[PDB]
């Protein structure tokens, strides 16, 4: 084993020069530049709605693009679509497998996708000539549990799995179109760029990668976390994203400078982060925690600006509407709350 | 109230019907007993699951005994890290762990040094002292008993346990194995281990599982009236 050592050394020097270039491009910091911006005042947002009806832990939720309807998944083998203005239940969909841990809502509003420990992504048609919701397709390519899934349009969907890979599917034929294999740990989350041309994934190897949908190659790899990355989300501008890991911190990366910008942590914070989301203009950075709470962060100066404290168990998922009017939180205590 | 339109009233009625269906399903699903089957590949889970019950992902097995319904989930096909999905199974009534007695001399194929029974003991140690399973009882099965009785004639137990000081009798070596597994438990005050030796036993396994489950359910019923 001699040539393998040469390859390892060449990779090591490649990483060294990459880090040298990143240091060359790291003269200033976001904290240094934003030192003279007036802070946003204390944020007091209160519970407007409580959605009841799930009889087990909520694992995922997702907003519709109309900012009124949302879908949530639970371990009791049910998938419920809610009307958030009225708290009326629109549909209740029983699943073949109750070990669900992800759900998604199509931007068109026509489909809902969920998957979990059965290693299958299922698509449901909501708008049929009959009155009921029926399964329209099952995608059975992955060899590990489904951890996240996001629609691109009515015919394409991207999924992440515990077999260290992401894939892109064709709904009508049902076949994998592309495979993304760079990761060396379980992929736990993904986020789509607002124009649906790139996307980022976070894996249990404490790294995040940026993938091109068309070619199917990893352009950039980001590091810095000391533990598993559980959540990921793009900045609305499209040139930055935030990650929340098990080391109790959030971090922000930019694509153009190809490195970390700023860290969000506090001494009193010890638990892991389950979910992360941005506000409509990107000024606020919401994050769900294991300590039963939710923190609101000023994304430009890394100081806490509020707390959402109403859940009796772990905050498992959260999302912000497209119009920026409300925040939804789901928890292991089986309740969904709409904050505003 | 009376500020709602006709279509709004009909949507409210639809929501009420969905709510009653959800409650009915919840009560139907609250009756069943759900178990989590574990253990290594060569442990003997196949005979176990095919004698209570008479491509990848979770496998669910449904059987019945004395008008009590059972559901047993096998997660042997999940080659992912246990820590990211094991918390899905907090709240199971009990955990069934299968071990093969006849592998006290065989070694794992992946590594020569790591002895197979020691691998089973390490998996048991990891599962027992996990923060999601503090108060979950464990039904421990020792399977290849007849092969153990046949193989201890010429294979000393010192091949696996260097400090063993007993004999070639089956019963005393079996007791030593049971003590080795039952002493990996560190809680010792909130959960119990139910060990049972079965090689070709019929309908004894189902009865043993039923008794352990009834004990667990009694101790859980004592946790709603405050008497515990």
């Amino acid at each position, epitope marked *: 084993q001699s040539e393998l050592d040469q390859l390892r050394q060449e990779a090591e020097q490649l990483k060294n020069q990459i880090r040298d270039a990143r240091k060359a491009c790291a003269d200033a910091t976001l904290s240094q530049i934003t030192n003279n911006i007036d802070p946003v005042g204390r944020i007091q947002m209160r519970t407007r709605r409580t959605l009841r009806g799930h009889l087990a832990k909520i694992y995922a939720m997702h907003w519709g693009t109309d900012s009124r309807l949302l879908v949530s998944a639970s371990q009791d083998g049910k998938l419920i679509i809610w*009307d958030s203005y009225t708290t009326n239940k629109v549909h209740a969909i029983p699943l073949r497998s109750s070990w669900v841990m992800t759900c998604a809502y199509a931007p068109s509003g026509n489909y809902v996708a969920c998957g979990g420990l059965d290693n299958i992504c299922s698509i449901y048609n909501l708008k049929t000539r*009959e*009155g009921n919701v029926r399964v329209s397709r099952e995608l059975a390519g992955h060899t590990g549990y489904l951890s996240c899934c996001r629609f691109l349009d009515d015919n394409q969907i991207v999924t992440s799995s515990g077999d260290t890979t992401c894939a892109l599917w064709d709904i009508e034929t049902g076949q994998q179109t592309t495979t993304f294999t760079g990761h060396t740990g379980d992929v736990m989350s993904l986020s789509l760029a607002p124009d649906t041309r790139l996307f980022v994934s976070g894996a249990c190897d404490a790294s995040a990668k940026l993938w091109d949908v068309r070619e199917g190659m990893c352009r950039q790899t980001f590091t810095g976390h000391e533990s598993d990355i559980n959540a990921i989300c793009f900045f609305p501008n499209g040139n930055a994203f935030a990650t929340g890991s098990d080391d109790a911190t959030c971090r922000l990366f930019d694509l153009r400078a190809d490195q970390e910008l700023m860290t969000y942590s506090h001494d009193n914070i010890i638990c892991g982060i389950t979910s992360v989301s941005f506000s409509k203009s990107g000024r606020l950075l919401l994050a769900g925690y294991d300590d039963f709470n939710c923190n609101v962060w000023d994304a430009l100066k890394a100081d806490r600006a509020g707390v959402l404290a109403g859940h009796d168990n772990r905050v498992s998922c959260l999302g912000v509407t497209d119009d920026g009017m409300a925040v939804a939180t789901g928890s292991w205590d089986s309740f969904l709350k709409i904050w505003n | 109230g009376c500020t709602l*339109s006709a*279509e709004d009233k009909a949507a409210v009625e*639809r929501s009420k*019907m969905i709510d009653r269906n959800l409650r009915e399903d919840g009560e139907k699903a609250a009756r069943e007993v759900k178990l989590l089957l574990l253990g290594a590949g060569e442990s003997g889970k196949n005979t176990i699951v095919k004698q209570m019950k008479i491509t990848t992902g979770i496998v669910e097995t449904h059987f019945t005994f004395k008008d009590l319904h059972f559901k047993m989930f096998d997660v042997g096909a999940q080659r992912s890290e246990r820590k990211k999905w094991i918390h899905c199974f907090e709240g199971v009534t009990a955990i069934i762990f299968c071990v093969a007695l006849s592998d006290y001399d065989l070694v794992l194929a992946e590594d020569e040094e790591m002895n197979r029974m020691h691998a089973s003991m390490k998996l048991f140690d990891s599962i027992c002292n996990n923060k999601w399973f503090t108060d979950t009882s464990i039904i421990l099965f020792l399977n290849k008993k007849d092969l153990f009785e046949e193989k201890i004639k010429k294979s000393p137990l010192t091949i696996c346990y260097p400090e063993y000081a007993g004999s070639n009798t089956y019963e005393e070596a079996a007791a030593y194995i049971q003590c080795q597994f039952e002493d990996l438990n560190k809680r010792k005050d909130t959960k119990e281990i139910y060990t049972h030796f079965t090689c070709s036993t019929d309908t004894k396994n189902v009865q043993f599982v039923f008794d352990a489950v009834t004990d667990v359910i009694i101790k859980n019923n004592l946790k709603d009236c405050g008497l515990f």
Partner: single-chain antibody
Amino acid sequence: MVQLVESGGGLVQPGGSRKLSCSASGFAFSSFGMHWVRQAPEKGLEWVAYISSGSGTIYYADTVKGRFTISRDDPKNTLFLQMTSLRSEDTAMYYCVRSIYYYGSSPFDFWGQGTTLTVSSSDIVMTQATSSVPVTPGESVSISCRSSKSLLHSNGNTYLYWFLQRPGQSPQLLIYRMSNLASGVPDRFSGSGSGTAFTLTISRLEAEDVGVYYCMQHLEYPLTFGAGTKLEL
């Protein structure tokens, strides 16, 4: 596919009872509410009765309340209308209409091919000004309807529906809630209005879509139709 078939009808003498049933096939019957709508010979539509999903809510029109009774047999997928003490003005062709109510749904989306019963020997009023409009293919026509009370609601919904009945066919939904085009309807019809005045626009008129157009309100029970305007070549 989706099908609704009614049975019964025939000749009945005054004061005698008769029973109508409708058989459904091809959709989830128990999730839908159902209506009965009758059409007198050479007249317009007139709502009759309604039963909700789960039979929790029942409404009748004043002209038939106390005489008719409506029920549904969910296991057998059948809707019933038991009529008692029929009157000479009960001669009509009865239709069965399915409707489902949730956010974003389109009620009145399927009308069964009706059955005929002939007998031997305040409420919002909807008005449509014209009654006969000569038309040429390729041009544009503007059917107009007007309501006595505003159909706009506090939540922002305008509860106006448009139906088309071609010669010899059952009525078909075109526009629901005054602006939303129906599923299979070609992108040639448009809905507009504000509060109490409403209009329906047709561009590039063709041969198949000549007939009678009705406006309907769904703000309060009972439901009321307008007098249809006939487009004639």
